[PDB]
Design an enzyme around this catalytic site. Structure first.
Site, PDB file in Angstrom:
ATOM      1  N   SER A 391      43.661  15.104 -42.354  1.00 14.23           N
ATOM      2  CA  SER A 391      42.326  15.159 -42.923  1.00 14.23           C
ATOM      3  C   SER A 391      41.598  16.406 -42.424  1.00 14.23           C
ATOM      4  CB  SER A 391      41.566  13.890 -42.539  1.00 14.23           C
ATOM      5  OG  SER A 391      42.327  12.735 -42.879  1.00 14.23           O
ATOM      6  N   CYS A 558      37.296   6.282 -41.639  1.00 18.89           N
ATOM      7  CA  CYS A 558      38.518   7.041 -41.488  1.00 18.89           C
ATOM      8  C   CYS A 558      39.256   6.744 -40.188  1.00 18.89           C
ATOM      9  CB  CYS A 558      38.193   8.529 -41.573  1.00 18.89           C
ATOM     10  SG  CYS A 558      39.564   9.632 -41.190  1.00 18.89           S
ATOM     11  N   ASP A 603      39.483   6.726 -45.870  1.00 22.50           N
ATOM     12  CA  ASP A 603      40.479   7.758 -45.612  1.00 22.50           C
ATOM     13  C   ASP A 603      41.230   7.225 -44.398  1.00 22.50           C
ATOM     14  OD1 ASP A 603      42.058   9.989 -45.284  1.00 22.50           O
ATOM     15  OD2 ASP A 603      40.484  11.176 -44.298  1.00 22.50           O
ATOM     16  N   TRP A 605      45.064   5.683 -42.568  1.00 17.26           N
ATOM     17  CA  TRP A 605      46.524   5.793 -42.494  1.00 17.26           C
ATOM     18  C   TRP A 605      47.073   5.028 -41.284  1.00 17.26           C
ATOM     19  CZ3 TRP A 605      43.086   9.697 -41.100  1.00 17.26           C
ATOM     20  CH2 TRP A 605      43.115  10.103 -39.738  1.00 17.26           C
TER      21      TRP A 605
HETATM   22  C1  FAD Z   1      46.174  10.686 -45.651  1.00 20.51           C
HETATM   23  C2  FAD Z   1      46.538  10.795 -44.312  1.00 20.51           C
HETATM   24  C3  FAD Z   1      45.657  11.364 -43.402  1.00 20.51           C
HETATM   25  C4  FAD Z   1      46.046  11.565 -42.082  1.00 20.51           C
HETATM   26  N1  FAD Z   1      45.253  12.269 -41.261  1.00 20.51           N
HETATM   27  C5  FAD Z   1      45.673  12.568 -40.024  1.00 20.51           C
HETATM   28  C6  FAD Z   1      44.865  13.317 -39.177  1.00 20.51           C
HETATM   29  O1  FAD Z   1      43.870  13.899 -39.609  1.00 20.51           O
HETATM   30  N2  FAD Z   1      45.198  13.437 -37.824  1.00 20.51           N
HETATM   31  C7  FAD Z   1      46.332  12.794 -37.315  1.00 20.51           C
HETATM   32  O2  FAD Z   1      46.650  12.947 -36.138  1.00 20.51           O
HETATM   33  N3  FAD Z   1      47.138  12.038 -38.175  1.00 20.51           N
HETATM   34  C8  FAD Z   1      46.806  11.933 -39.531  1.00 20.51           C
HETATM   35  N4  FAD Z   1      47.697  11.436 -40.401  1.00 20.51           N
HETATM   36  C9  FAD Z   1      49.033  11.024 -39.913  1.00 20.51           C
HETATM   37  C10 FAD Z   1      50.010  12.198 -40.025  1.00 20.51           C
HETATM   38  O3  FAD Z   1      50.148  12.608 -41.387  1.00 20.51           O
HETATM   39  C11 FAD Z   1      51.382  11.854 -39.442  1.00 20.51           C
HETATM   40  O4  FAD Z   1      51.853  10.605 -39.957  1.00 20.51           O
HETATM   41  C12 FAD Z   1      51.271  11.780 -37.917  1.00 20.51           C
HETATM   42  O5  FAD Z   1      50.683  12.990 -37.431  1.00 20.51           O
HETATM   43  C13 FAD Z   1      52.669  11.597 -37.321  1.00 20.51           C
HETATM   44  O6  FAD Z   1      53.534  12.601 -37.859  1.00 20.51           O
HETATM   45  P1  FAD Z   1      54.816  13.120 -37.036  1.00 20.51           P
HETATM   46  O7  FAD Z   1      55.684  13.849 -37.990  1.00 20.51           O
HETATM   47  O8  FAD Z   1      54.357  13.825 -35.819  1.00 20.51           O
HETATM   48  O9  FAD Z   1      55.537  11.754 -36.583  1.00 20.51           O
HETATM   49  P2  FAD Z   1      56.808  11.174 -37.382  1.00 20.51           P
HETATM   50  O10 FAD Z   1      58.018  11.891 -36.919  1.00 20.51           O
HETATM   51  O11 FAD Z   1      56.481  11.177 -38.825  1.00 20.51           O
HETATM   52  O12 FAD Z   1      56.885   9.649 -36.871  1.00 20.51           O
HETATM   53  C14 FAD Z   1      55.781   8.774 -37.119  1.00 20.51           C
HETATM   54  C15 FAD Z   1      56.178   7.327 -36.822  1.00 20.51           C
HETATM   55  O13 FAD Z   1      56.554   7.146 -35.450  1.00 20.51           O
HETATM   56  C16 FAD Z   1      56.430   5.736 -35.192  1.00 20.51           C
HETATM   57  N5  FAD Z   1      55.726   5.584 -33.899  1.00 20.51           N
HETATM   58  C17 FAD Z   1      54.510   6.315 -33.486  1.00 20.51           C
HETATM   59  N6  FAD Z   1      54.235   5.673 -32.186  1.00 20.51           N
HETATM   60  C18 FAD Z   1      55.204   4.796 -31.930  1.00 20.51           C
HETATM   61  C19 FAD Z   1      55.353   4.003 -30.871  1.00 20.51           C
HETATM   62  N7  FAD Z   1      54.717   4.384 -29.767  1.00 20.51           N
HETATM   63  N8  FAD Z   1      56.217   2.979 -30.854  1.00 20.51           N
HETATM   64  C20 FAD Z   1      57.014   2.754 -31.980  1.00 20.51           C
HETATM   65  N9  FAD Z   1      56.864   3.629 -33.063  1.00 20.51           N
HETATM   66  C21 FAD Z   1      55.969   4.627 -33.008  1.00 20.51           C
HETATM   67  C22 FAD Z   1      55.601   5.160 -36.331  1.00 20.51           C
HETATM   68  O14 FAD Z   1      56.449   4.513 -37.291  1.00 20.51           O
HETATM   69  C23 FAD Z   1      54.981   6.402 -36.943  1.00 20.51           C
HETATM   70  O15 FAD Z   1      54.703   6.152 -38.329  1.00 20.51           O
HETATM   71  C24 FAD Z   1      47.305  11.159 -41.654  1.00 20.51           C
HETATM   72  C25 FAD Z   1      48.180  10.570 -42.562  1.00 20.51           C
HETATM   73  C26 FAD Z   1      47.804  10.402 -43.891  1.00 20.51           C
HETATM   74  C27 FAD Z   1      48.726   9.932 -44.819  1.00 20.51           C
END
Ligand code: FAD
Ligand code: NAP
Ligand code: FMN
EC number: 1.6.2.4
Length: 606
Positions: A391, A558, A603, A605
């Site tokens: 966001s 959000c 907003d 997630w």
């Molecule tokens: C519309 C929208 C808005 C968003 N806005 C933001 C934002 O502004 N700022 C922000 O930080 N994020 C936001 N996100 C989330 C962001 O897009 C990512 O999903 C997030 O940053 C994680 O991405 P990654 O690739 O680092 O982790 P990934 O490699 O994609 O892995 C994520 C997954 O790890 C797993 N996981 C996380 N913690 C643990 C745990 N401790 N124990 C077990 N499983 C766990 C969960 O299944 C999580 O979904 C938003 C998501 C959406 C869809």
């Protein structure tokens, strides 16, 4: 061209359309498609965007025609972008669909307002039109386990198809590859994809317009740790979008294409005994399909595993099945084949050993060492690497040439004793300011400041949920500078402790001092014996909020969509109920009506 015609000319009787944004519905529709064969049928999958769904009324021209929809839902019970056209057609048509046979499996998430609204609409609509439902609507909940929901549904869909059409299970449960490998021992670098999406050299040679197929490589001008602790890492990024023509407004999302961890990629190649630097191409055996390659080709395995393939999420059961054949140790192969069972000990071990243990591909190849599949087959089984959404934390009126991001880095230890790292956050974390390019694009949303600057705004966003509001407040202050009347601006923020993860503390304090931020109410959840959240502060302010609300203020929520958003909405029901003198059920209708008027936006997630 007509998809009905396409089917006739290619011997297909089953067509599965996918409504997909992040590939899940697509992979689902594909699995269904390959399944046709096991029941004496010929299937194909398709992107509805590439055809005219009005052609549905011609399906009867193919004996035993069967259409299936694997649809996911998005922003407010809306269709994914590739299904928008189909949606619009479904609403203005009154075409007679007698004779058409369908089945719908919807992909959705219970934590969202309008649950599986797309699937429900498509399913309810085909019937109203006259088509015949062959098998109940599938309600996939990604807040639970979408994969299991799906295999449970599939296991029942096929029998119902068999019964209705009079076909049978060949039981030819063997294995088939979608692509064939072709090594490129003699190639130029100008011919090899290096991680870019869409056309070749699109990253090197940047030309607009920039979108998800043509991402603008933005420079990281800023990247600073926001919190004082060290147990977690919260960061503020500023991506320079100068010379991109890209436009945005506070409320819009910024998407980015990350790269996987270098080491993880090497540990993979090393355990598979594969020369990651070999350039290659995987080509579709069905010479008729548009999808000629599973990912940009040709390309080295290294490039593929780092930029195009997801190697971190727990694999879906169909991926655990195909791999089972490359495991020599009996007990290790037992385990992998069984996890594909809908229920029994198979669903159990799958949910526990794979999902809950958060075991990625390398973790599996590691805890089942007898497993040795070829790297090219793995590249066909693994899902594509999706972009991540954030966001925007900036107002384009103050920062037209920059796009800001507020993110929390994902890193945790698993029950499998491993340390898992989030792909995009760790990647963004390693981008140095002042070299350091982030491939991104802006996705529009309906999250927006009031049309009138005088309308008051109530913003609720704890943790990283504060992101879009940082932009809102910047804009609102800037509107006061332009000498315009600005209504009240309240931010209900929250974090664990004031001396740890209080994001933007200085900036937010300055804003309140300047008067731009009418109020700054923060809930520290771990500074006292019990939990103190934003919905508690909202409760205490029941009086003023009811006033602003009845006055026509806009509410914004959000952040975490699992509990926070729900608790905050229940608190707002209570406010309206207690102070509007109406009944709770009436308050619920009241808040829902606000959402439809655009005055209660979400907003969220997870
Ligand atoms: C519309 C929208 C808005 C968003 N806005 C933001 C934002 O502004 N700022 C922000 O930080 N994020 C936001 N996100 C989330 C962001 O897009 C990512 O999903 C997030 O940053 C994680 O991405 P990654 O690739 O680092 O982790 P990934 O490699 O994609 O892995 C994520 C997954 O790890 C797993 N996981 C996380 N913690 C643990 C745990 N401790 N124990 C077990 N499983 C766990 C969960 O299944 C999580 O979904 C938003 C998501 C959406 C869809
Ligand atoms: O992800 P992120 O890192 O941005 O967020 P986060 O740090 O996990 O959470 C941000 C704030 O939201 C609080 N919170 C947790 N559950 C809540 C709920 N159900 N309703 C309202 N606030 C809640 C957290 O308190 P706790 O995490 O201390 O509960 C913390 O104070
Ligand atoms: C920005 C965003 C909005 C979503 N909105 C909804 C929604 O309104 N209703 C719902 O049931 N699921 C919603 N979901 C969940 C998706 O429908 C679910 O994750 C689906 O598996 C995604 O499929 P795809 O990869 O095929 O697009 C949303 C997901 C994201 C990321």
């Amino acid at each position: 061209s007509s998809f009905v015609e396409k089917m006739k000319k290619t011997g297909r009787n089953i067509i599965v359309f996918y409504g997909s944004q992040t590939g899940t519905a697509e992979e689902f529709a594909n699995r269904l498609s390959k399944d046709a064969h096991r029941y004496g049928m010929r299937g194909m999958s398709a992107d509805p965007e590439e055809y005219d769904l009005a052609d549905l009324s011609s399906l009867p021209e193919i004996d035993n025609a069967l259409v299936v929809f694997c649809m996911a839902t998005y922003g407010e019970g809306d269709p994914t972008d590739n299904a928008q056209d189909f949606y619009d057609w479904l609403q203005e048509t009154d075409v007679d669909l007698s004779g058409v046979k369908f089945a719908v499996f919807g992909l959705g998430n219970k934590t969202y307002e309008h649950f599986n609204a797309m699937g429900k609409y498509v399913d309810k609509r085909l019937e109203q039109l006259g088509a015949q439902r062959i098998f109940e609507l599938g309600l996939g909940d990604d807040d639970g386990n979408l994969e299991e929901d799906f295999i449970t549904w599939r296991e029942q869909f096929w029998p119902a198809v068999c019964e209705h059409f009079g076909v049978e299970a060949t039981g030819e449960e063997s294995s088939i590859r979608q692509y064939e490998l072709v090594v490129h021992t003699d190639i130029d670098a100008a011919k090899v994809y290096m991680g870019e999406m869409g056309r070749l050299k699109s990253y090197e040679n940047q030309k607009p317009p920039f979108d998800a197929k043509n991402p603008f490589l933005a420079a990281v001008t800023t990247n600073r740790k926001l919190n004082q602790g060290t147990e977690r890492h919260l960061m503020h990024l500023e991506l320079d979008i100068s010379d991109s023509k890209i436009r945005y407004e506070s409320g819009d999302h910024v998407a980015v294409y990350p790269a996987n961890d270098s080491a993880l990629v090497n540990q993979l190649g090393k355990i598979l005994g594969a020369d990651l630097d070999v350039v290659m191409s995987l080509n579709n055996l069905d010479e008729e399909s548009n999808k000629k390659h599973p990912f940009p080709c040709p390309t080295s395995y290294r490039t593929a595993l780092t930029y195009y393939l997801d190697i971190t999420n727990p694999p879906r059961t169909n991926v655990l099945y195909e791999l089972a054949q490359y495991a020599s140790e009996p007990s290790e192969q037992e385990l992998l084949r069984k996890m594909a069972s809908s229920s029994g000990e198979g669903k159990e071990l799958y949910l526990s050993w794979v999902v809950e243990a958060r075991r990625h591909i390398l973790a599996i190849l590691q805890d089942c060492p007898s497993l040795r599949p070829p790297i090219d087959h793995l590249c066909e089984l693994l899902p594509r690497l999706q972009a991540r959404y954030y966001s925007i934390a900036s107002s384009s009126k103050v920062h037209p040439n920059s796009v800001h991001i507020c993110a929390v880095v994902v890193e945790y230890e698993t029950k499998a004793g491993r340390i898992n790292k989030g792909v995009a956050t760790n990647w963004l974390r390693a981008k140095e300011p002042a070299r350091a390019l982030v491939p991104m694009f802006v996705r529009k949303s309906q999250f927006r400041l009031p049309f009138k600057a005088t309308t008051p705004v109530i913003m609720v966003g704890p943790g990283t949920g504060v992101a879009p509001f940082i932009g809102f407040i910047q804009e609102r202050a800037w509107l006061r500078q332009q000498g315009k009347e600005v209504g009240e601006t309240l931010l209900y923020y929250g974090c664990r402790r004031s001396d740890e993860d209080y994001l933007y503390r200085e900036e937010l304090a300055q804003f309140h001092r300047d008067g731009a931020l009418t109020q700054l109410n923060v809930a520290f959840s771990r500074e006292q014996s019990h939990k103190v959240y934003v919905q508690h502060l909202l409760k205490q302010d029941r009086e003023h909020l009811w006033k602003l609300i009845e006055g026509g203020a806009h509410i914004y929520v959000c952040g975490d969509a699992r509990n926070m958003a729900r608790d905050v909405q229940n608190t707002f029901y209570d406010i309206v109920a207690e102070l509007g003198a109406m009944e709770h059920a009436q308050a619920v209708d009241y808040i829902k009506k606000l959402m439809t008027k655009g005055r209660y936006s979400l907003d969220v997630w997870s």
